Design a binder for this molecule. Structure first.
Ligand SMILES: O=C(O)CNC(=O)C(=O)O
Ligand code: NI
Lengths: 68, 13, 329
């Protein structure tokens, strides 16, 4: 339903593959994160769902991540 | 001697 | 150094055109969404950028009084590219010494002045605020808790890399590098001027850069001579420059100069950010010269995208309550 840029979709896929494959002593899961495996799982689902983002509709001029 | 981070410098010769 | 810096400043061979000359009005989030901040940018005036800077005649002694005489600052010895430290009063003494009485050539490119009186005098381009991972991704109550104005890591509550003051005497040179963590840079010439050599982060050029780093001949091989296309460009007083992730650059200072600038990660060139991080890993760069809390930040990025899009939080309950309190302010 939201449209991400291909810049973001490709970058989030790189980032999830990167963080998932770091061993425990290099993963650096920070203090605020609850269950990082469930996070990795949710990101993969979301990337599948957003894979058909439309490139023109992604150009909203406002970032998807902003504070309320 | 506190450790620092975010120091901008290229590598030494 | 065995290469001739004067010939690198005089030759016409670094004639690539990689920089886009833009008006500030046009540097907005839609521009970043469309182009991925892949091109170096120069803003010959500040109209429309939303920047703020100190008085036009601000001096190094003024910077000193704002950050403290006793603040330790990292300094580069230009001849060796090695680091040393002194206090800001000692640096100011050096900078105020006539040119012919200075024994050595020193540069400061690493004074991060957040959480000092200087911080509210300088604001970077508004668009950077909308995309920087620090401002948009790191838990806000942790960033707001920072008290320490130095870059001591034990007191650092977020990646403290947003606002730096560069003070460079005539003759300063900073050899080719890529900024830490594949950060993008904004750079405003408050007084003076700078000369940059720019090399694009193609796979082949990033392989050359890493091999040059591993060879340890940086003083012998001017890296812009090793690549197919390099651009040397002059930045004049009042210009603002934005360097994209990954770009390999060197910088020469033709006149005493004061710059305000800073670093940021963002969501539109994460593959390059990750590529640069891994070069630093392979080349054994000491942590002090790296982006603080880099993978911690990357975890918070994943959590923000999932929350913002799906309303599913992966922060602890306590962190969620800290955030909700700040939403009600
Ligand atoms: O200004 C200098 O001497 C060096 N500056 C940089 O490398 C930079 O701002 O990214
Ligand atoms: Ni740099």
């Amino acid at each position: 339903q939201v449209h991400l840029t291909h810049f973001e979709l490709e970058g989030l896929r790189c980032l999830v593959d990167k963080l998932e494959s770091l061993p425990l002593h290099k993963k650096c899961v920070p203090t605020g994160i609850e269950d990082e495996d469930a996070l990795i799982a949710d990101v993969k689902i979301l990337l599948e769902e957003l894979a058909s983002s439309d490139p023109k509709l992604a150009l909203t001029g406002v970032p998807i991540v902003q504070w309320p | 001697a506190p450790a620092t981070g975010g120091v901008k410098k290229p590598h030494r010769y | 150094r065995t290469f001739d810096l004067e010939e690198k400043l005089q030759t016409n061979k670094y004639n690539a055109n990689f920089v886009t000359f833009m008006e500030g009005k046009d540097f907005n989030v839609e521009y970043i969404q469309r182009g991925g901040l892949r091109d170096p940018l120069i803003f010959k005036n500040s109209d429309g950028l939303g920047i703020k800077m100190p008085d036009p005649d601000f001096t190094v002694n003024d910077v000193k009084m704002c950050v403290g005489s006793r603040r330790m600052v990292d300094v580069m010895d230009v001849n060796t590219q090695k680091g040393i430290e002194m206090t800001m009063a000692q640096w100011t003494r050096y900078y105020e010494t006539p040119e012919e009485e200075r024994e050595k050539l020193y540069n400061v490119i690493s004074l991060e002045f957040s959480h000092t009186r200087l911080e509210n005098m300088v604001q970077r381009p508004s668009t950077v605020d909308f995309i920087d991972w620090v401002d948009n991704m790191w838990p806000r109550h942790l960033k707001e808790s920072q008290t320490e104005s130095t870059n001591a890591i034990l007191e650092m509550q977020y990646p403290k890399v947003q606002k730096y003051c560069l003070m460079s005497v005539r003759g300063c040179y900073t050899d080719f590098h890529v900024d830490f963590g594949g950060t993008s840079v904004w750079y405003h010439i408050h007084q003076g001027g700078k000369v940059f050599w720019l090399i694009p982060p193609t796979a082949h050029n990033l392989e050359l850069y890493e091999n040059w780093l591993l060879s340890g001949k940086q003083g012998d091989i001017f890296l812009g001579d090793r690549v197919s296309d390099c651009q040397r460009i002059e930045l004049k007083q009042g210009y603002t420059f934005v360097i994209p992730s990954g770009w390999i650059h060197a910088v020469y200072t033709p006149t005493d100069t004061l710059v305000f600038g800073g670093n940021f990660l963002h969501s539109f060139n994460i593959p390059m950010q990750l590529k640069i991080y891994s070069i630093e890993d392979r080349t054994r760069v000491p942590n002090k010269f790296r982006y603080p809390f880099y993978y911690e930040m990357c975890w918070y990025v994943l959590e923000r995208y999932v929350y913002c899009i799906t309303n599913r939080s992966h922060l602890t309950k306590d962190f969620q309550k800290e955030s909700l309190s700040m939403d009600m302010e």
